[PDB]
Amino acid sequence: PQETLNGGITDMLTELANFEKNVSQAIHKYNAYRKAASVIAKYPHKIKSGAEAKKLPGVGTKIAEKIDEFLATGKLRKLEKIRQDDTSSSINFLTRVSGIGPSAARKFVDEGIKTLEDLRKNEDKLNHHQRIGLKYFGDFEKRIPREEMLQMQDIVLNEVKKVDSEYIATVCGSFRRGAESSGDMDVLLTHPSFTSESQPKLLHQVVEQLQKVHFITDTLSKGETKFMGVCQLPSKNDEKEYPHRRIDIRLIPKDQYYCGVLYFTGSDIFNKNMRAHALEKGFTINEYTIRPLGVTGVAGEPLPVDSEKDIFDYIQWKYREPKDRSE
DNA sequence: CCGACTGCGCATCAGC
DNA sequence: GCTGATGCGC
DNA sequence: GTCGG
Ligand SMILES: Nc1ncnc2c1ncn2[C@H]1C[C@H](O)[C@@H](COP(=O)(O)OP(=O)(O)C(Cl)(Cl)P(=O)(O)O)O1
Ligand SMILES: [Mg+2]
Ligand code: NA
Ligand code: NA
Ligand code: NA
């Protein structure tokens, strides 16, 4: 695991993953490419043959021969064809706009709309999310210094307590994994009257306060238990203005905080691997519970697990501190 | 051969 | 008006 | 695409 050790191969595989997910709409081939890329990135030798990478789990016949052509030529003809393709590469660029998924991108590129500027000229064709994602295209691709994360944590934690002092609020994602910067802010919220009982306005009246102090600036999706939006650091003096940042708030049964904070921590590829091999041991994890798989695919009742892990040694795994879960 | 593949809330689409 | 499906991004 | 029934 030393980045440049096989970065060429994993670059190519990540670039293929993206083409599959954005252009072919083959979310399974995408996941397969992402899994081959990940395992190879952890592998502690430099691959010199597709047959050597083939021994790894998740590398198969087709990827092995893509490794050989890459090794032998420096290039992948499929990739270089794909990158040169004005329709494929437009669709790929469009999906970088929050809210423009792969189906939207195709529909836009089909009707001639290929650039951000094409998009601005056609805002009637855009739902609410897409205009916001287009409004803030550059900002949403910037990183958030951990120091700005902490200032965002102050505002969130301050304004949350102002509403109701038995709210707990927990900033998860890469932040809680110690990351020196983050892509967005992930806030986990629990309140004692949300368990198996309930009154469901707990999220709304927290969003509203954060809007009232002008921290939250836009709304991408808002529900009973999940808010997705935009939020900005207040600025001072004649300062440059901070960028607009993506924030999600997720409100979990307090009874199920542990599964919630594990999922939201996560990382995302780490969750995919932990759940996948929770399956191998006949358990299923989600943000809520951990359940056994009975004779075949059961659930019925889960245990209200009491510890910050146990989730973790139920699946015969040695505890990975959040620093060690960006994997 | 063939199907499973990590898991899910909200917005919007499809349809009655 | 409703229910149920799909796209989308966690 | 890969893996396993
Ligand atoms: N497909 C998924 N499956 C399971 N869990 C997921 C998935 N996607 C997201 N999560 C969980 C896990 C994920 O950790 C959490 C927050 O999602 P972010 O997209 O913000 O992930 P991140 O780690 O914060 C990041 Cl490295 Cl992208 P940053 O934006 O900080 O740079 O939601
Ligand atoms: Mg994050
Ligand atoms: Na193998
Ligand atoms: Na997008
Ligand atoms: Na997020």
DSSP A140-185: HTS-EEHHHHHHHHHHHHHHHHHH-TT-EEEE-HHHHTT-SEESSE
- What 3-state DSSP class applies to A18? helix
> What CATH fold (topology level) applies to the domain A143-263?
Beta Polymerase; domain 2 (3.30.460)
Residue A183 Cβ < 6 Å to ligand 1: yes
Instruction: Give the ligand at the shortest distance from the Cα of A248.
Output: 5
Q: Is CATH 1.10.150.20 the classification given to domain A86-142?
A: yes
Placement of tokens 């040169």 in the chain: A84
Phi, psi of A82 (to 5 degrees): -60, -45
Please tell me the distance between residue A70's alpha carbon and the centre of ligand 1 in angstroms: 31
Q: Take atom 3 of ligand 1 and give the residue whose Cα is closest.
A: A268
Taking residue A237's Cβ as centre, other Cβ atoms within 10 Å add up to: 5
Domain covering A4-85: architecture: Orthogonal Bundle (1.10)
Q: How far is the CA of A37 from the C1' of C4 (A)?
A: 37
Instruction: Name the residue type at position A3.
Output: E
- Domains A4-85 and A86-142 fall in the same CATH topology: yes
Which atom of ligand 1 lies nearest, measured to the CA of A175? 30
Strand duo A226-232 + A244-251: pairing? antiparallel
Alpha carbon distance A309, A316 (integer Å): 11
Which runs of E-coded beta strand occur in chain A? 144-145, 168-171, 181-182, 185-190, 216-222, 226-232, 244-251, 283-285, 290-292
A265 touches A308 (CB < 8 A): no
Task: For ligand 1, say whether the CB of A98 is within 6 Å of any of its atoms.
Answer: no
Place of tokens 């992930």: A186
Q: Tokens for A197, please give them.
A: 């009982």
Single out the residue of A21, A27, A34 nearest to residue A63, CA to CA: A34
Burial class (CB in 10 A: 0-12, 13-18, 19+), A5: middle
A266 token code pair: 């996560």
Q: Give the 3-state secondary structure of residue A65.
A: helix
Cβ-Cβ contacts under 8 Å for A199 (sequence gap 6 or more): A193
Q: Which residues contact A212 (CB under 8 A, 6 or more apart)?
A: none
Which nucleotide is closest, CA of A62 to its C1'? D1
Q: Are strands A226-232 and A290-292 parallel, antiparallel or unpaired?
A: unpaired
To the nearest 10°, report the CA torsion of A170, A173, A177, A182. -110
* Active-site residue, from A21, A35, A66, A114: A66
User: Stated in angstroms, how far is A86 CA from B2 C1'?
Assistant: 36
Q: Nearest Cα to A129, choosing from A29, A210, A239, A218? A: A218
For residue A172, report the distance from its CA to the centre of ligand 5, in Å.
9
Q: Kindly list the distances between the CA atom of residue A22 and the CA atoms of A18, A29, A88, A183, in Å, as whole numbers in the listed order.
A: 6, 11, 9, 20
Residues A67 and A50: beta-carbon distance below 8 Å: yes
**What are the Cα distances from residue A245, in Å, to A28, A102, A141, A234, A281?**
30, 23, 9, 12, 39
Domain segments of chain A: what residues?
4-85, 86-142, 143-263, 264-326
Structure tokens at A146: 């951990």
Collapse the DSSP code of A236 into the 3-class scheme (helix H, G, I; strand E, B; otherwise coil) and give the result.
coil
Find out whether A243 and A186 touch, Cβ atoms under 8 Å.
no
Give dist(CA A189, CA A252) in Å, integer. Answer: 6
Tokens of A114: 């290929």
Where b means 16+ CB within 10 Å and e means fewer, A77-102 reads: eebeebeeeeebbbbbbbbebbbbbb
Contact by Cβ (8 Å): A13, A36: yes
Cis preceding linkage at A193, omega within 30: no
Active site (annotated) includes residue A66 = yes
A85 CB-near residues (< 8 Å, 6+ apart): none
- Within 10 A of A151 (CB to CB), how many other CB atoms are there? 15
Q: Give the end-to-end CA distance of chain A in Å, rounded to a whole number.
A: 11
Beta bridge partners of residue A168, listed in sequence order: A190
Do the beta carbons of residue A232 and residue A218 sit within 8 Å?
no
- The CA-CA-CA angle for residues A22, A25, A26, to 5°, reads 115
A257 CA to B13 C1' distance (Å): 34
Q: Which residues touch strand C (CB under 7 A)?
A: A 25, 95, 97-105, 133, 184, 186, 228, 246, 248, 268
Q: Is-contact A13 A33, C-beta < 8 A?
A: yes
A185-190 β-sheet, strand order: A168-171, A185-190, A244-251, A226-232, A216-222
Question: Of A247, A249, A261, which is closest to residue A311 (Cα–Cα)?
Answer: A261
* Contact between A300 and A290 (Cβ < 8 Å): no
